[PDB]
Amino acid sequence: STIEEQAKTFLDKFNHEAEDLFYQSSLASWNYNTNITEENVQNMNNAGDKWSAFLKEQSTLAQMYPLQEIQNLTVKLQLQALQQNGSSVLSEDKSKR
Amino acid sequence: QVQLVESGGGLVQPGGSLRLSCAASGFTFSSYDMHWVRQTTGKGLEWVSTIGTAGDTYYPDSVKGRFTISREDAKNSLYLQMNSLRAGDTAVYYCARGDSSGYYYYFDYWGQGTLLTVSSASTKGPSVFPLAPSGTAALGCLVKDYFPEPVTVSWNSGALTSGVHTFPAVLQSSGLYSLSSVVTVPSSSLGTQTYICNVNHKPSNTKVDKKVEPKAC
Amino acid sequence: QVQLVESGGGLVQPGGSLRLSCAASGFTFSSYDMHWVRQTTGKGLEWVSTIGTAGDTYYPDSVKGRFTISREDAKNSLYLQMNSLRAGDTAVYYCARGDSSGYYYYFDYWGQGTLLTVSSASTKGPSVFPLAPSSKSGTAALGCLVKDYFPEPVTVSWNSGALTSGVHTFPAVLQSSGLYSLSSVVTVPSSSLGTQTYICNVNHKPSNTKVDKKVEPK
Amino acid sequence: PNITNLCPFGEVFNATRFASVYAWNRKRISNCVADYSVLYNSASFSTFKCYGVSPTKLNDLCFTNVYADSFVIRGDEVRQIAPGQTGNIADYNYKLPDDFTGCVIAWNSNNLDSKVGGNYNYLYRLFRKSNLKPFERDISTEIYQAGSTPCNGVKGFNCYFPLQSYGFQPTYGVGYQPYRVVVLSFELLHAPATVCGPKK
Amino acid sequence: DIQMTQSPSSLSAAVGDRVTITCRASQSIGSYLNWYQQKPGKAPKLLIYAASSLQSGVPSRFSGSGSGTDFTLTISSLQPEDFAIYYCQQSYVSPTYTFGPGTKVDIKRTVAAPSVFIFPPSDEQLKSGTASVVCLLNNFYPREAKVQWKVDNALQSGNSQESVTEQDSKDSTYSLSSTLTLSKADYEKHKVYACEVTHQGLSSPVTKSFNRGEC
Amino acid sequence: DIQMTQSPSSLSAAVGDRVTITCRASQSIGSYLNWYQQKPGKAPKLLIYAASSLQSGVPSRFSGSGSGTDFTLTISSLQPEDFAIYYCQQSYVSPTYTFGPGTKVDIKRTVAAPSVFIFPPSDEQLKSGTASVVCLLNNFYPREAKVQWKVDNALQSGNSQESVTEQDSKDSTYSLSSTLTLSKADYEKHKVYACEVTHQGLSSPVTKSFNRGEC
Ligand SMILES: *[C@@H]1O[C@H](CO)[C@@H](O[C@@H]2O[C@H](CO)[C@@H](O)[C@H](O)[C@H]2NC(C)=O)[C@H](O)[C@H]1NC(C)=O
Ligand SMILES: *[C@@H]1O[C@H](CO)[C@@H](O)[C@H](O)[C@H]1NC(C)=O
Ligand SMILES: *[C@@H]1O[C@H](CO)[C@@H](O)[C@H](O)[C@H]1NC(C)=O
Ligand SMILES: *[C@@H]1O[C@H](CO)[C@@H](O)[C@H](O)[C@H]1NC(C)=O
Ligand SMILES: *[C@@H]1O[C@H](CO)[C@@H](O)[C@H](O)[C@H]1NC(C)=O
Ligand SMILES: [Cl-]
Ligand SMILES: [Cl-]
Ligand SMILES: [Cl-]
Ligand SMILES: [Cl-]
């Protein structure tokens, strides 16, 4: 079980979970944008929050596969799209500010 | 002797419809599955449709919704109705008998094929000209400016077959086809045998009998 | 690396004689049988002669009395003397090592061949002309024309063999004059026409002709 | 061959409930006349392919047993229900043998098996240590171990729960819609035939 | 479905030669394989079914072998009438039977020079305003041939079309027609019409010509 | 002696195809059969000995089978560098070893249009009194191609010779040269020199031309 193989399996699970959650969120967003109501805004916001939380935890997991051990460029690209740290490199106070 | 004979191919406009027939003889028609298989220069032999002996019909996805196979056992006949025709349906359409030895299925008898041409162009019938002979001598007929394919050519009502070459048609810059049938004969026979070419172009209902005679200068 | 290299082919008049040589390297020459095998377009591959390791020599009937095979183990060398040559002896002559696994004999190594031409015509060396690369153009083409030579063959290289990719040396053509003519071309980047020098090296051994022609945009 | 009862094809094709592909259902059909005509010229079937025998000859054939396997997958996966195929379904869920004799039928079941919001009751196996043998069925829920670290029965890093839900929604595109699938296996042993067509 | 592949694409062999063509299935299909023969203008003809059973009436020189994924059709002794394209077909998956792309079997025979004939345009055609001149090269081998039109020894280009027959099933030769197309005005402006034929069976180009209004 | 016969004479197949060639000996020779490969301009290369033993260093796609009088050489997956003539040879009767006539293995590949170039005569050659104009068609497939010379838009005949390379071992294409020969006098009488190239890979004929004294 190499790092690249583990990463392939991880991305498999990620894809299957992500497509479903992204569909539920996109459908909530569509229901809002075509039918503006408070119920639909709350559904859209809840689904979007669930999607963001999923991506947060999945990026945390993705960071546990070091890219420098990935030789396959497709696997590398996907892992990279997940492993973006961004503003999270800042302290809690600096990111808050 | 088992025989299958296709009919009904010809010119048809895009989006149009057309029925193909196949007449069977020499076997108990009701006892066999029947099939349509098409052939094109680009994609080779391709199964188009099948009808069994229990009314069951089968089609590939490319054909389902557009074509319908059927059979009239009382007239030993097979039919293919074709709707919504596209240029890519241009092909030679064969009917074919299916049979099996044990579990192994095969197409043991085929018709002669009927050419389907799907084009918005119009039909034109050929002009037929003699190629006059001027030892062994050669003579022939020139079949020029026709659409669509095909023309069929025989000699002396099919009594003349040895030495005949009917060339494959050529597509001229005009979009019309042109073809030539020739025959080589004993020179001495030019004054003892009359030579007539019989040309047929069904899409225009053209039947021509042209006599080929040595030319006067 | 086993290597065999033939020498001595060329033009010879009917009834004449000529000796072919084969130089071996990369094995114990004395320990192997050696062979001459000839090739013609009309009759394919044909066994010409054999010499074993005990001085034993073998010939087809068509050749016995006319050709003689021999070997010089001290010089890792094989020889074929040929007398009473006829037009029908014109062919490519290969030397070949024979070897066996169990009872199964085979020819595991071949030379490159040497062309013997039996003709009463005379040798002529080629003229070598540049086929200059178009000023208009990316990929560019250039070459050399080797005209009016006899007999075959001429060999053509480029930049002393440093240039091989993209080269086409065409098969020779027999002109109505009885002379052969050939042209070697090469395709190169257009941009390289001002950064690389292109020289064709033409060699015609029967006339001892060696020419190096530089091909330049005009 | 004294047979007068018709084979219960309608019980298979027209059941209200189909099994998830990982726990695929099997019904044994024996001792009956198989009237395949109710399967012919269906406006519903998007797939009717047979293997080893021709559909046109099914009423002339006798078999020792017939097996009706049924389940739901997505449309894009119907192609995997065939000999020689590979993919999540063929490798980990339902495997046909290379010398398969039988038919594979399928129809779109979006109207029955989708639900706005997602029908999560249909599962498929996504991970497995090895591929299935033909006609094998794996209903385990053991956590798949993707790394050197033991999973100790808990999902986590490199430790995945092996089943996954299709979550069918009626608004899905056709490739993601549910398809109901029936696989008829024609078994021939050194035993008298019990299933025959009406013409035999 | 199941994809079928054939090898070689084409094959030249001599009469009496053993011909061997192969067929491959994209997956194992046991013995569910048939072979068909197709000659120009004719429908396919069943030769072999179940990988190795010879269809009734097919000559015994045809035979089929193989199982699983690779299959072979063999002609023990190629006859001239065997020139054709041969197709394999898997019978394992129905109704979606699929065919191989075909293997063409050409006959190699001795060089035969063409017989050359030239045909002036008919008067009936000339009444219509166009002139067709036809050059016929009859029963030659090999297929490679060059035809050049000369009108008053002006070489013609771009005003001719060629057609070649499929290999003859009896004598294994080819025939070729070249048709020169001229306006009636051009046809009557010039006198000498010639076609010059180059073929490997001729020691030197052969010209057949005629003068417009002459015997 | 023992006569060796091969089948087919030639065959065209695509890269990756299974190629199958047969060899027949005029009498039984057990397993005393070798196979050789010969590429253009090169010496024969031993592939198989003892009917089925693969010579050291030969790629594993080559294999030999057979016994008695009939033998087979098989290339499991044709590679471009395999374009060649293959010969069998009986090792049963010595010293009179005999070879088969050879089987040509050509590569079928996608259509590739020629790159066309034209070359005016060198000044040194003109000083010698003759002019050679060269037209080059580079790296095309299939081999069929037509080139026509025009001098001041006058079509030429009988004053040109063509040469074609053997199939390239890397890309399986062909190249062709056409050489027009004129007297220095005839060459200096005209201005426009063009070659017009027809090939199946081109939508319309391609002409490359030059004027006598321009660069
Ligand atoms: C599943 O149920 C349908 C009815 O809901 C059955 O359909 C009938 O089948 C008979 C026999 O072919 C036809 O004559 C009727 O017209 C059908 N009725 C309808 C409403 O379609 C169907 O046969 C059942 N499936 C099976 C396998 O028995
Ligand atoms: C819009 O949203 C409201 C509240 O969720 C719902 O009652 C209503 O049916 C929706 N309209 C449509 C057209 O779906
Ligand atoms: C990279 O991995 C993917 C599977 O994750 C595979 O489809 C692809 O072929 C691989 N690429 C290479 C170059 O091996
Ligand atoms: C995210 O952060 C980790 C360390 O916390 C680092 O190793 C990783 O490289 C970062 N991601 C990227 C894309 O650099
Ligand atoms: C066949 O079974 C039926 C009951 O289904 C019975 O009435 C009949 O007698 C049986 N006949 C034979 C020949 O066994
Ligand atoms: Cl077509
Ligand atoms: Cl999937
Ligand atoms: Cl398989
Ligand atoms: Cl012109």
Please tell me the distance from the alpha carbon of residue D120 to that of residue D99, in angstroms, as a whole number.
34
Q: Which chains touch C (3 or more CB pairs under 8 A)?
A: F
- Closest Cα in chain B, distance from residue D54 (Å): 7
Contact residues for E182 (Cβ-Cβ < 8 A; gap 6+): E130, E131, E132, E133, E151, E159
Interface of F with C in 19-48 (CB under 8 A): 31-32, 34, 36, 42-46
**CB-ligand 3 contact for A11 (6 Å cutoff):** no
Q: Is the separation of the CB atoms in E115 and E57 below 8 Å?
A: no
- Residue contact A10–D126, C-beta within 8 A: no
Answer yes or no: are the C-beta atoms of A53 and A1 closer than 8 Å.
no
Taking alpha carbons only, the member of F164, F168, F119 closest to residue F145 is F164
Ligand 6 centre and the CA of B153: distance in Å? 20
Amino acid at D89: I
Contact at CB, C110 and F44, closer than 8 angstroms: yes
Same fold, F4-108 and F115-211: yes
CB of F161 less than 8 A from some CB of E: no
Judge if the beta carbon of residue A67 lies within 6 A of ligand 4: no
Element (H, E) at B209: strand B206-212
Cβ distance A24 to D165 less than 8 Å, yes or no, reads: no
Q: Does the distance separating the beta carbons of E215 and B132 come in below 8 Å?
A: no
Cβ-defined contact of E94 to D84 (cutoff 8 Å): no
| Interface touch E93/D50, C-beta < 8 Å | yes
Examine residue F95 and say whether the peptide bond preceding it is cis (omega within 30 degrees of 0): yes
Question: CA separation (Å) from D17 to D1, D43, D117?
Answer: 33, 21, 20
Rounded to 5 degrees, φ, ψ at F31 are -110, 15
Q: How far is it, in rounded angstroms, from Cα A13 to Cα D158? A: 10
Burial class (CB in 10 A: 0-12, 13-18, 19+), E1: middle
Structural domain count, chain D: 2
- F153 and chain E: CB distance < 8 Å anywhere? no
What are the phi and psi torsion angles at D133 (to 5°)?
-70, 155
Partners of residue E66 on adjacent β-strands: E71
d(CA B107, CA B214): 48
Tell me the DSSP string of B159-176: TB-TTEEEPPPEE-TTS-
Residue B124, beta-bridge partner list: B147
Residue A92's H or E segment, with its range, is helix A92-96
Q: Of F10, F21, F198, which to mutate for an interface test with E (greatest number of E Cβ within 10 Å)?
A: F10
Query: Which residues place a Cβ less than 5 A from the ion ligand 6?
Result: B 40
3-state secondary structure (DSSP) of residue A29: helix
Domains and CATH numbers, chain C: 3-118 (2.60.40.10), 127-215 (2.60.40.10)
With respect to CATH, is domain F4-108 assigned 2.60.40.10?
yes
Q: Which two tokens stand for residue E92?
A: 């394992």
Q: Is the separation of the CB atoms in F37 and F64 below 8 Å?
A: no
Query: What is residue B107's three-state secondary structure?
Result: strand
Give the whole-angstrom CA distance, residue E129 versus residue B145.
Answer: 13
Of F65, F45, F67, F68, the C-alpha closest to F55 is F45
> The tokens of E204 are what?
């030197």
Residues D113 and D126 both lie in one domain:
no
Judgement on whether residues D99 and D153 belong to the same structural domain of the protein: no
The 8-class DSSP code of residue D38 comes to G
Task: Quickly count: other Cβ atoms within 10 Å of residue C111's Cβ.
Answer: 24
> How far apart are the CA of F101 and the nearest CA of chain C, in angstroms?
6
Residue A78 Cα to ligand 4 middle (Å): 14
My answer on whether D138 and D85 are in the same domain is no
Tell me: do D164 and D176 sit in the same domain.
no
CA-based end-to-end distance of chain B: 51
User: Across the interface, do B129 and E122 touch by the CB < 8 Å criterion?
Assistant: yes
Topology of domain E115-211, CATH: Immunoglobulin-like (2.60.40)
At a CB cut-off of 8 Å and minimum separation 6, what does C205 contact? C10
C-alpha pair distances (Å), C18 with each of C6, C22, C89, C95? 13, 14, 11, 16
Please write down the long-range contacts of B61-69, taking CB distance under 8 Å and 24 or more positions apart: B67/B36, B69/B34, B69/B36
Give the Cα separation of C210 and A18 in Å (integer).
73
F4 with F26: CB under 8 angstroms?
Answer: yes
Unique residue bearing structure tokens 């790394």: D147
Mapped to the 3 state alphabet, what secondary structure does chain C carry?
CCEEEEECCCEECCCCCEEEEEEEECCCHHHCEEEEEEEECCCEEEEEEEECCCCCEECCCCCCCCEEEEEEHHHCEEEEEECCCCHHHCEEEEEEEEEEECCEEEEEEECCCEEEEECCCCCECCEEEEECCCCCCCEEEEEEEEEEEECCCCEEEEHHHCCCCCEEECCCEECCCCCEEEEEEEEEEHHHHHCCCEEEEEEEHHHCEEEEEEECCC
- From A32, A37, A41, A43, mutation site for ligand 2 pocket: most ligand atoms within 8 A of C-beta: A37
**Residue F88, amino acid:** C
Location of structure tokens 């086993």: C2
- Ligand 5 near D4 CB (within 6 A): yes
Q: Which two tokens stand for residue B109?
A: 């008898």
Out of E43, E100, E138, closest to residue B94 by CB:
E43
Contact A12 D167 (CB under 8 A): no
Q: In this structure, what token pair is assigned to residue B181? A: 């049938």
Same domain, D30 and D99: yes
Atom 4, ligand 2: residue with shortest CA distance: A39
Contact F15, F111 (CB under 8 A): no
Based on the fold, state whether residues D107 and D28 are members of the same structural domain: yes
Amino acid identity at C91: A
Resolution (A): 2.7
Distance separating alpha carbons of residues E139 and E135, to the nearest angstrom? 13
Q: Which of E160, E105, E168 is nearest to E138 (CA)?
A: E168
Pocket test for ligand 1, best of D14, D29, D35, D44 (most atoms within 8 A of CB): D14
The response to whether residue A24 sits with its C-beta less than 6 Å from ligand 4 reads no
Find tokens 């935890």 and name the residue. Answer: A57
Q: Both D60 and D144 in a single domain? A: no
Which one-letter DSSP state was computed for residue A54? H
Residue A48 contacts by C-beta under 8 Å, 6 or more apart in sequence? A25, A28, A29
Domain ranges for chain F, please list them.
4-108, 115-211
- Do D26 and D80 fall within a single domain? yes
Parent domain of D182: 1-117+170-200
Residue D127 CA, ligand 3 centroid: distance in Å: 18
Measured CA to CA, the distance from residue B211 to residue B194 in angstroms comes to 8
- Whether the CB of B113 is below 8 Å from some CB of chain D: the reply is no
Structure tokens that stand for D157 in this block: 């890093």
Distances (CA, A) of D52 to D25, D82, E92, F88: 23, 12, 5, 42
H or E, element range at E125? helix E123-128
Rounded CA gap, D125 and D163, in Å?
Answer: 4
The C-alpha of C74 sits at a distance from chain F's nearest C-alpha, in angstroms, of: 25
**E154 lies within 8 A of chain B by CB:** no
Nearest neighbour of D164 by CB, restricted to A9, A16, A27: A16
Q: Please give the helix or strand (H or E) that residue A56 lies within, else none.
A: helix A38-62
Indicate the SS3 state at residue E142.
Answer: coil
Distance of CA E17 to the CA centre of its chain: 20
Tell whether D112 and D188 lie within a shared domain.
yes
Strands F103-108, F10-14: pairing is parallel
- A85 Cβ below 6 A of ligand 4: yes
State the DSSP code for B215: P
